[PDB]
Structure formats: C-alpha cells, structure tokens
C-alpha cells in the first residue's frame with residue numbers, strides 16, 4: 001500500500017537554472033484569441049492531456065474528463081450556444097481542436113489545477129489557447145456534447161497555432177515583489 | 185494597446201518529443217507527506233512563484249498572493265490552528281518553507297490554475313510537496329499571518345526535499361483512455 005518514494009535530486013546550481021528557464025518558458029505564454037485553422041498533431045494533444053492528468057486530486061478522485069472536439073460542425077454548435085447565452089467568437093470555429101474540461105461531481109480545485117498543468121503543457125509544446133470558463137453555457141453544452149449528469153463544464157480551451165496576424169494586448173505582469181510576501 | 189504576438193514554433197517531431205518528456209517529468213510528481221528539514225534555495229522558491237505568477241486570470245486581475253513562511257515558530261503556530269480545526273501533521277514543522285496561496289476577492293479558478301503552475305514548477309525543480317486546502321482554518325490563518333480582509337486562503341503547500349525515508353501510497357493514475365473523450369462524426 002505504501003512504497004518507498006523515488007526522487008531525482010538536482011544540485012542547487014541546476015535547480016536554480018531549471019527553475020529559471022521554466023519560468024522563462026511559461027512567461028512567454030499569452031492567451032491568444034486569433035487561432036489558425038492549421039492541423040496540430042494528435043500526439044501532442046494527447047500528451048498535454050496526459051500531462052494534465054498528473055494533477056493531484058482531493059482524495060485521489062482524479063475527477064476530470066477531457067472532451068476533445070474536432071468536428072467542424074460540433075465546434076460551431078458549441079459556438080452558437082456560447083454566443084446565445086447573452087442575453088443581456090471565431091476562434092471556436094477556426095481552432096483545429098477544442099478541449100473542454102468537465103469536473104466529475106474539492107473537485108473544482110483539483111480540476112482547475114489540472115487545467116494549470118494543461119496550460120503549461122501547451123506552452124511547453126508550441127501551442128496557444130485562451131483560457132475561458134463559460135459556466136452559464138455549461139448545462140446546454142453538457143447536453144449538446146452528451147456528457148452525463150455527474151459532469152459539469154469548467155474550462156473550455158481552443159487550441160492551435162496563433163494566426164499569422166495574431167496580436168495580444170500590451171499587458172504587464174505583476175513583478176515578484178507584488179505577489180510574494182515573506183514572513184520573518 | 186494591442187501588439188503583434190511573438191511565437192516560438194517547433195517542428196512537429198519536436199512538439200511530440202517536448203510534450204512527451206514534459207509528461208514524463210510531471211508524472212513523476214507525487215504528494216509527499218514526509219519532508220526533510222534541509223534548507224532549499226530561496227532563488228528556487230522565488231522562481232517557482234514567478235512561474236505561478238504567469239497564470240492566466242479572469243479579467244487580468246492576477247489576484248493571487250504567495251505568502252512565504254520560513255520562521256520555525258510561525259510554522260508551528262500554523263500547524264496548531266490546522267490541527268485544532270477538528271473538531272469532530274509534522275511536515276508543517278519539518279518542511280523548510282511554507283507557501284500559502286491566498287486569493288484576492290472567477291478569481292478562485294485563476295488562483296487554482298496558478299497553483300497548478302506552481303506545482304509543475306516545483307516538480308521541475310527537484311522539490312516536493314503535498315497539496316492541501318484547509319479552508320476551515322482559512323480565517324484564523326488570515327489573522328495569524330496578518331493578511332488583509334480581501335484575502336482568503338486557498339492552498340497551503342509545504343515545500344522541501346523528501347525525507348531520506350519518505351514513502352508514498354501505491355496508487356495508479358487513470359490511463360488516457362479513462363480521462364479523454366473524443367467527439368467524432
């Protein structure tokens with residue numbers, strides 16, 4: 001039931017270096033809302049989901065379902081509902097792949113952490129997306145997509161290469177001194 | 185306001201390879217509840233937090249605060265409250281560093297995603313932890329730690345090297361076919 005645990009320990013210098021570079025890698029990440037229609041490899045899609053599946057989960061429930069949508073039609077019907085639920089865009093059609101993460105009713109925290117791992121894994125693999133969380137369209141998408149009662153939509157990520165013409169907003173990230181407080 | 189966006193595109197082969205290896209790296213991760221007292225570099229601690237700070241955030245609120253506790257005393261007082269809130273362990277003392285992530289009142293999803301990035305970054309840097317989320321001790325820790333009204337505790341992660349004697353439970357992860365469903369037709 002409890003086995004010894006096998007670690008890979010790096011010399012402090014390399015721990016600094018590995019952590020620096022990883023930071024450098026992720027900081028290049030930006031939500032991209034202009035996504036090419038260009039095929040992306042299914043092996044990479046699978047790999048990032050495998051990555052996301054390595055998340056910790058409250059009580060080890062591993063309560064996540066990763067729904068991969070590729071059918072152009074399905075993607076459009078998804079687009080329609082989302083847009084409909086206001087009620088007071090294009091990437092959902094142009095992206096090659098939709099990944100919707102449903103949680104299986106702490107679960108929400110696990111799943112979202114899993115989404116975090118998913119995001120890192122795309123960045124690390126040369127793909128972009130724009131995280132979104134249309135919880136108001138959740139129900140109708142549960143039904144459209146055939147998901148069972150016990151799944152509720154959490155995150156919807158359109159995945160692909162950026163458009164040759166893509167742009168992002170000129171936004172700056174908080175510096176470290178603005179997000180980290182040390183107790184002495 | 186809107187600048188062109190600069191991408192690094194890898195040839196498909198390398199995208200496969202990079203994504204495989206990253207998967208291999210993260211899959212080595214396991215919550216470890218036996219943590220050595222051995223100093224860990226502050227530069228690595230800072231780096232993983234910087235990484236966690238790169239998360240996406242609803243409306244770009246970036247609403248996370250990363251409280252680093254190192255004082256042995258402070259860590260103990262934190263331990264006491266947590267244990268007290270049942271009311272029907274040791275790693276919080278033995279770990280060199282506590283990282284508590286508070287959210288600043290979608291925020292909860294952003295922050296948790298950020299925690300995900302934090303977890304990857306520790307794994308990637310040779311450190312372990314055991315994710316936990318003592319929301320019942322949140323209030324008393326807000327006060328103990330001096331955090332302001334608008335912060336609520338979310339995640340508490342004790343960080344360190346595993347114990348020379350550490351063990352984990354023999355748990356298997358769902359295979360891909362168990363967490364991934366493809367829509368065709």
Ligand SMILES: Cc1cc2nc3c(=O)[nH]c(=O)nc-3n(C[C@H](O)[C@H](O)[C@H](O)COP(=O)(O)O)c2cc1C
Pocket residue numbers: 054055056057058059060106109110113213214215217314315316317352355
């Ligand atoms: C939201 C959340 C809360 C958790 N709370 C605790 C906890 O209170 N105590 C604990 O030992 N582990 C806690 N964990 C860790 C899980 O028990 C651990 O991730 C699970 O056993 C899966 O094991 P693994 O992380 O090695 O894959 C929590 C994990 C998550 C995602």
Ligand SMILES: Cc1cc2nc3c(=O)[nH]c(=O)nc-3n(C[C@H](O)[C@H](O)[C@H](O)COP(=O)(O)O)c2cc1C
Pocket residue numbers: 029030031033130131132133168171238239240241242243244290293294297
């Ligand atoms: C929980 C969550 C929900 C989000 N929802 C949307 C959304 O509905 N539309 C959108 O364009 N971006 C959405 N985003 C992306 C954020 O707007 C984006 O991350 C933020 O502008 C920061 O920019 P960056 O990711 O490039 O750092 C969401 C992000 C998070 C974390």
